[PDB]
Design a protein around this ligand. Sequence first.
Ligand SMILES: [Zn+2]
Length: 188
Amino acid sequence: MDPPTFTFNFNNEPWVRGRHETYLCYEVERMHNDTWVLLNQRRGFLCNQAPHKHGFLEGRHAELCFLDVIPFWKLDLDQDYRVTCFTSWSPCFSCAQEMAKFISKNKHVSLCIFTARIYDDQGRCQEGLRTLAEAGAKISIMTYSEFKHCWDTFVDHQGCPFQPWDGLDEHSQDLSGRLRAILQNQEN
Ligand SMILES: [Zn+2]
């Protein structure tokens, strides 16, 4: 892990050059009712690009890979599991359907996804976002404070301190307004 490894992916603001880049960072934790074990010491990353070794990209979603990663770890249903995924983009329609059904098959795992920015892939898909909030695990806008936590865990700040600002958080407040509308329509 490099000190700016997390900042590099988040510093993709300029990536708007006509190329599509996806960066996903996630962590896994084991929790027991008697005690809680934090495997934060280890971490991993997922990309939405298909494997280069087979040749040209064949098609792989970064968010979809994480959902398949849980079942690959053969997690125990009798043991509590807490998994968090850090991503900054909207999920593909195929991922929305899998995210809702996935939790239905595993409600014993606490899954939380933070999106720095949310863009609607298509219109009339507002219903998918509402369902995604209910079954698409818990989703919230990443705040600078939350970013600081990922900064220490994903990168060894030892010797390399991160200086956070309330600039990105200001944009999140406006984004929360649009997202609030989706949650505001939460019919009782
Ligand atoms: Zn997908």
